[PDB]
Amino acid sequence: AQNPNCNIMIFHPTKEEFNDFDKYIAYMESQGAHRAGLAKIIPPKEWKARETYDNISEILIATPLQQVASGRAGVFTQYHKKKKAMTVGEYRHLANSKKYQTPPHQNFEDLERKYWKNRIYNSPIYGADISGSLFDENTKQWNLGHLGTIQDLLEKECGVVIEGVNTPYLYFGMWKTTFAWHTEDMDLYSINYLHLGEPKTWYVVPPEHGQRLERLARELFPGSSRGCGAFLRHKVALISPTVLKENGIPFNRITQEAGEFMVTFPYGYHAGFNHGFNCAEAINFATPRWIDYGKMASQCSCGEARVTFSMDAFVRILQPERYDLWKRGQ
Ligand SMILES: O=C(O)c1ccnc(CNCc2ccco2)c1
Ligand code: NI
Ligand SMILES: [Zn+2]
Domain locations along the chain:
1-330
Longest dimension (CA), the chain: 55
Cross-strand bridge partners of residue 15:
none
What is the spatial distance between Cα 221 and Cα 75, in angstroms, rounded to a whole number? 9
How many C-alpha atoms does 246 have within 13 Å on its Cβ side?
9
What is the spatial distance between Cα 166 and Cα 282, in angstroms, rounded to a whole number? 11
Q: Residue 255: exposed, middle, or buried by beta-carbon count in 10 A (0-12, 13-18, 19+)? A: middle
Contact in structure between 180 and 119 (CB atoms under 8 Å): no
Cβ contacts of 133 within 8 Å, gap of 6 or more: 144, 145, 167, 168, 170, 281
Nearest-atom number in ligand 1 for the CA of 171 is 1
Using the Cα atoms of residue 266, residue 267, residue 268 and residue 270 in order, give the sign of their dihedral. Answer: positive
Name the DSSP letter for residue 15: T
Contact in structure between 263 and 289 (CB atoms under 8 Å): no
For 218, other C-beta atoms within 10 Å of its C-beta total: 15
CA 38 to chain centre: 10
Ligand nearest to the CA of 326: 3
Q: Please name the residue whose Cα sits nearest to atom 14 of ligand 1.
A: 283
What is the spatial distance between Cα 9 and Cα 25, in angstroms, rounded to a whole number? 12
Cβ contacts of 33 within 8 Å, gap of 6 or more: 3, 9, 11, 39, 263, 265
The DSSP element (H or E) to which 24 belongs, if any, is: helix 21-30
Cβ contacts of 264 within 8 Å, gap of 6 or more: 37, 38, 184, 189, 190, 191, 192, 204, 270
Pairing of the two strands 38-41 and 9-11: parallel
State phi, psi for 279 to the nearest 5 degrees. Answer: -140, 125
What is the spatial distance between Cα 107 and Cα 280, in angstroms, rounded to a whole number? 22
What is the spatial distance between Cα 227 and Cα 139, in angstroms, rounded to a whole number? 45
- The topology (CATH level 3) of 1-330 is Jelly Rolls (2.60.120)
What is the spatial distance between Cα 277 and Cα 192, in angstroms, rounded to a whole number? 16
Cβ contacts of 225 within 8 Å, gap of 6 or more: 217, 218, 231
**d(CA 226, ligand 1 centre) in Å:** 26
12 is in an annotated binding site: no
Mutual angle of helices 150-158 and 310-318, in 10-degree steps: 20
Short-list 138, 118, 132, 250, CA closest to 178: 118
Contact in structure between 95 and 196 (CB atoms under 8 Å): no
What is the spatial distance between Cα 293 and Cα 59, in angstroms, rounded to a whole number? 36
Alpha-carbon distances of 161 from 154, 157, 191, 255, 292, rounded to whole Å: 8, 10, 24, 39, 18
Contact in structure between 41 and 263 (CB atoms under 8 Å): yes
What is the spatial distance between Cα 134 and Cα 292, in angstroms, rounded to a whole number? 32
What is the spatial distance between Cα 38 and Cα 202, in angstroms, rounded to a whole number? 9
How many C-alpha atoms does 21 have within 13 Å on its Cβ side?
16
What is the spatial distance between Cα 144 and Cα 133, in angstroms, rounded to a whole number? 8
Ligand nearest to the CA of 330: 3
Does the CB atom of residue 180 touch ligand 1 within 6 A? no
Contact in structure between 73 and 116 (CB atoms under 8 Å): yes
192 is in an annotated binding site: yes
Contact in structure between 254 and 261 (CB atoms under 8 Å): no
What is the spatial distance between Cα 225 and Cα 43, in angstroms, rounded to a whole number? 40
**d(CA 180, ligand 1 centre) in Å:** 10
State phi, psi for 72 to the nearest 5 degrees. Answer: -110, 165
Q: Please name the residue whose Cα sits nearest to atom 17 of ligand 1.
A: 179
Q: Please name the residue whose Cα sits nearest to atom 16 of ligand 1.
A: 282
State phi, psi for 218 to the nearest 5 degrees. Answer: -60, -40
Quick one: residue 176, left, alpha or beta (phi over 0 = left, psi -120 to 50 = alpha)?
A: left
Using the Cα atoms of residue 284, residue 285, residue 289 and residue 290 in order, give the sign of their dihedral. Answer: positive
Q: Residue 59: exposed, middle, or buried by beta-carbon count in 10 A (0-12, 13-18, 19+)? A: middle
Q: What is the resolution of this structure in A?
A: 1.4
The DSSP element (H or E) to which 82 belongs, if any, is: strand 75-82
Does the CB atom of residue 172 touch ligand 1 within 6 A? no
CA 120 to chain centre: 21
CA 73 to chain centre: 22
**d(CA 200, ligand 1 centre) in Å:** 11
**d(CA 283, ligand 2 centre) in Å:** 9
